[PDB]
Symmetry: C2
Subunit: 510 residues, 2 copies
């Protein structure tokens, strides 16, 4: 019914602004596009429906930490005046009050969720991800039943990856190049949109850099010469992912663990509380999650930015054919062949890496990924009727070639956030005990404000340099206190979660 | 050929003291006993052949640490005079020289292997175990090919386990009951055979306690009423193991981590170096591995002690029938039906738990398990011809019901020893750095003898109480130094090994 299959997909697949408002059609795609193309959406369909429960919990989190501080303002004023020492050696009557508590307005949306909301939420995602991956494993068996009733050389890349890990250099350059663009020496508007430049300065850059590799790995496999032609994508995707994986997440890891650390600068409290970009960004504090929130914020939303290119790039090629034009398959000769399925999943799993891996930075991470998918489903299936004049109807099944690859990213989901979730909200649940050991417990966690902050910082240059207090040398050893505690979490976390996650694919897959 | 099948198994299966001296027969059992009974031995066959390479490495270890100290005596005299302070506050002119270095003769076979030999060897076993489990996974496919060419309610147990974990109490009782038996207040002969009493006092006890559960879980499943009759053993074995698992390994965990720790006793160096069983076992030191070596030593060898009961218990029932006797299947009416396959594997996996789980205490652990198997194979198959007059010839395949269960124990193999391998040989590889930081490295690890030992002990009551030195309160914080390091190992270990082990079932199973 091409008068219908078009229009039924023309008309039951052009919601294109939000939901269809009716349902989600699957089986009919299985008749028109075959098995493979349809089995994409049936995955992309399940990927959305599972975000909803976890997405909503995000809004339940923001409402938590906000309303956990919106009503009795518990950790605002005590938190709005812990930074007000942060520039004391910097004041010295000269440049005294510039940004001492400037972190406060920036400290809120971080310092609002950490212990109860973030440290919780990751445990649901990892438990969720196993729920998801276990769910799809079975739901794939369902549609597998319907069709099953109706089925009648290597070291060269190792140098290439090390090439990619030099991309950290590339982020640093334009990060150093924020000065030549606007140079905002302010607190209200200069903090945000200063880094957001180099982000958008850079986050554009990876985009053009992305399809570079697609011509790279495509030929870089040809040196391998895979015997079975069908297994070419295996050596293709498996190469194509790892490239694009570390191509994308790498800046975040630089802004996740490495940026704050690795800070060697002598000179004590006389010499520390000023030496920071020549005192024009934040003499008080960094609050790296803000940089970590933001840079994911774009990447969560830049999946919409580049999204229009998915419709814009193909229609833009019409300018080429139309230009040659003035300067039933008859008209069908003037549209690109499909040749594009792995980019379809590939857009998703680079999205899936954000939902699960970096999930203790901001809990709303599922939510932005849910907004795109409603567009992502509606854009793509649009692109199959609107564009892609030649469906192959390959009519294979069994998406497992990705099922490991998506599942593997689930396997990373526990270590990474574990360090994220450990090294940012674990001064507090043990700093109850150094200071408030006598009669000050969980109702007295608002006591370590000036005490824990009386020193240089909280990080590696936070506890070591305390010698001129009383006399690095004789005092950097309380550093060993927490750095066991940070560690002690992970050995508690990944073991439980990897076991708790072991529940889900233990009774549910059967 | 019953005139041959008997005699061929009568004669090619009564080596019964050592090897057959010829070969190992498998396929013929597959003809006589069928598929199931034979597929046991084909497992038990592979379980031995894989111990040999790992067994030998054990002897290569003892030879290592011994000959690493047998020739230049490196860590004997320096180690024979670290304990010679251990009773200094205990001497005080009254009861001075009793057992100050008594640990020395006991310290040798422990303090001989630790850093290079033990910390190595576990990495091979875990890598070995995955090699084994990966090997059998494929070798099972081999014999699977031959036969495949020729195939033409729950919370109640949770209370029961908690009942079992009270068995730690049971070990403590007769452990307290060593005084009423001989009471050896000596160092040469009193140290060993004092604990060995309560071991043999207890290690007998679990034996009679074992088959108690077999009547327990057998009925305790009947309340479940499994629908499929064949899946009864599943709810049977899976219950039967976990009971017998924690029934056996539990004393070791008490003597592994919990015994040394949990020691709260105030009074400083004036009050510490004596208060130990009223000063009659070892005022110097514990060296818990000795207790840990010994109690495994019996259990490695008690698989031979109870072994003769496997032949002794059945023939002992002949005293009952013969007594009624004087006080071709004709004579066949007077022998017990088989009804015993799960105990067959069950003897093994309780053995396998010792090879892999507790493998950093003494590396020879595979070796004692290899001596039994040559007897275990020859005893059992003897028991099928000699006894068990009624073979069923069930003629199923596919041992996977245990393949998880044996593999699961492999999964525990990495955490447990990791703490064993961490909390016993990791003062040393970082105690190079507190004391010998200037010009004393790996060639100067013999410098921390008196220094690291100058304090109370090395354990939790080893570093905290140092206040009367200079002034628990002000000094228990170097405790945080190593206790990060102990932790830092595990988060390094189980991740690598679980990945390194991930290699083996990644190219080899295919
Ligand atoms: Ca996108
Ligand atoms: Ca797309
Ligand atoms: Ca035995
Ligand atoms: Ca036996």
């Amino acid at each position: 019914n091409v008068e219908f299959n078009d229009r039924k997909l023309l008309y039951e697949e052009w919601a294109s602004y939000g939901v269809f408002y009716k349902y989600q059609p699957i089986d009919l795609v299985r008749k028109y596009f075959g098995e493979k193309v349809g089995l994409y959406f049936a995955w992309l369909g399940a990927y959305t429906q599972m975000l909803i429960p976890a997405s909503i919990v995000g809004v339940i989190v923001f409402l938590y930490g906000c309303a956990t501080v919106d009503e009795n303002i518990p950790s605002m004023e005590m938190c709005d005046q812990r930074y007000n020492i942060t520039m004391c050696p910097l004041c010295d009557k000269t440049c005294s009050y510039w940004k001492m508590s400037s972190a406060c307005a920036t400290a809120r949306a971080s310092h609002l969720f950490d212990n109860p909301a973030t440290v919780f939420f990751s445990v649901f995602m990892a438990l969720w991800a196993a729920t998801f991956m276990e769910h799809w494993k079975r739901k794939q068996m369902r549609l597998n039943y319907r069709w099953d009733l109706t089925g009648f050389i290597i070291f060269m890349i190792a140098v290439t990856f090390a090439i990619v890990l030099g991309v950290i250099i590339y982020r640093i350059s334009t990060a150093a190049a924020l000065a030549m663009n606007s140079s905002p020496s302010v607190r209200s508007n200069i903090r945000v949109t200063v880094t957001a430049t180099a982000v958008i300065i850079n986050l554009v850059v990876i985009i053009l850099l992305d399809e570079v590799y697609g011509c790279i790995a495509r030929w870089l496999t040809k040196i391998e010469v895979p015997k079975t032609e069908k297994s070419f994508e295996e050596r293709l995707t498996f190469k194509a992912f790892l490239l694009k994986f570390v191509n994308s997440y790498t800046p975040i890891f630089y802004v996740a663990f490495f940026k704050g650390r690795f800070v060697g600068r002598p000179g004590d409290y006389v010499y520390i509380f000023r030496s920071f970009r020549m005192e024009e960004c934040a003499p008080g504090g960094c609050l790296m999650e803000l940089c970590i929130q933001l840079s994911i914020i774009m990447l969560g939303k830049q999946l919409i930015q580049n999204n229009l290119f998915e419709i814009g790039i193909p229609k833009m090629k019409k300018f080429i054919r139309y230009l040659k034009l003035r300067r039933r398959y008859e008209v069908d000769f003037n549209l690109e062949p499909f040749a594009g399925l792995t980019p379809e999943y590939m857009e998703m799993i680079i999205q899936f890496g954000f939902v699960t891996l970096f999930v203790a930075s901001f809990p709303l991470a599922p939510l932005f990924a849910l907004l795109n998918n409603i567009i992502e489903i509606r854009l793509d299936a649009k692109k199959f009727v609107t564009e892609l004049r030649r469906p192959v109807a390959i009519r294979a099944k069994d998406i497992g070639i990705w099922y490991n690859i998506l599942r593997g990213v689930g396997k990373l989901a526990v270590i990474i956030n574990a360090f994220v979730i450990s090294f940012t909200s674990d001064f507090i649940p043990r700093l109850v005990y150094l200071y408030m050991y006598s009669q000050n417990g969980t109702m007295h966690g608002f006591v370590n404000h000036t005490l824990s902050s009386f020193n240089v910082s909280d990080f590696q240059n936070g506890t070591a340099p305390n010698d001129p207090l009383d006399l690095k040398y004789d005092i950097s050893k309380d550093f060993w206190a927490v750095l066991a505690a940070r560690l002690a979490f992970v050995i508690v976390f990944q073991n439980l979660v990897m076991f708790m996650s072991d529940f889900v694919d233990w009774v549910i897959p059967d």
